[PDB]
Amino acid sequence: MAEDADMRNELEEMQRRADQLADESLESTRRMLQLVEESKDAGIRTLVM
Amino acid sequence: IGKMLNAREPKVVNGPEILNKYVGESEANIRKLFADAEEEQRRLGANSGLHIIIFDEID
C-alpha cells in the first residue's frame, strides 16, 4: 500500500418539508390548548353560579 | 475449551479478513471485538465470564 486516502461524501436531505408553514400546525395545536381551558374554567364555575 | 469453560461465545476472526485501504478502518474492526468484553468487565466487576477471541491467522 503506502496508501493514504482521505475522503468526503454528501448528504441526501429527508422529506416532509414542502414549505416551512407545516410547523404552523403546531401553532394550531397551541391554539387548541389556548381555546380549551376557558371552556371548562367557565363551565364548572358557571355551574357554581 | 470455550465449551470447557463457558465464555459468552467465541467470535472468531481471520487477520487478512480485516484490513482496509483506508487509514482508520483497519484498527476499529479489532476494537469492536474487545468492546463486548469491556462492557461486561466494567459493569459486573471481576466475576464476569470470559469474552474469548480467536484469530485465524495473525501472522
UniProtKB/Swiss-Prot annotation, chain A:
UniProt feature, compositional bias: Basic and acidic residues: 1-20
GO molecular function: calcium-dependent protein binding; lipid binding; myosin binding; protein domain specific binding; SNAP receptor activity; SNARE binding; syntaxin-1 binding; transmembrane transporter binding
Cellular compartments per GO CC: actin cytoskeleton; axon; axonal growth cone; BLOC-1 complex; cell cortex; cytoplasm; cytoskeleton; endosome
Places the protein is found: Cytoplasm, Perinuclear region; Cell membrane; Synapse, Synaptosome; Photoreceptor inner segment
GO biological process assignments: associative learning; axonogenesis; calcium ion-regulated exocytosis of neurotransmitter; endosomal transport; exocytosis; locomotory behavior; long-term memory; long-term synaptic potentiation
Region (Interaction with CENPF): 1-49
UniProt PTM comment: Palmitoylated.
Function: t-SNARE involved in the molecular regulation of neurotransmitter release. May play an important role in the synaptic function of specific neuronal systems. Associates with proteins involved in vesicle docking and membrane fusion. Regulates plasma membrane recycling through its interaction with CENPF. Modulates the gating characteristics of the delayed rectifier voltage-dependent potassium channel KCNB1 in pancreatic beta cells.
Family the UniProt entry places it in: Belongs to the SNAP-25 family.
Protein name: Synaptosomal-associated protein 25
Name of encoding gene: Snap25
Part of the full-length chain shown: 1 to 49 of 206
Curated annotation (Swiss-Prot), chain B:
Annotated localization: Cytoplasm
Subunit field text: Homohexamer. Interacts with GABARAP and GABARAPL2. Interacts with GRIA2. Interacts with PLK2, leading to disrupt the interaction with GRIA2. Interacts with MUSK; may regulate MUSK endocytosis and activity. Interacts with CDK16.
Function: Required for vesicle-mediated transport. Catalyzes the fusion of transport vesicles within the Golgi cisternae. Is also required for transport from the endoplasmic reticulum to the Golgi stack. Seems to function as a fusion protein required for the delivery of cargo proteins to all compartments of the Golgi stack independent of vesicle origin. Interaction with AMPAR subunit GRIA2 leads to influence GRIA2 membrane cycling.
Family to which this protein belongs: Belongs to the AAA ATPase family.
Name of the protein: Vesicle-fusing ATPase
Gene of this entry: NSF
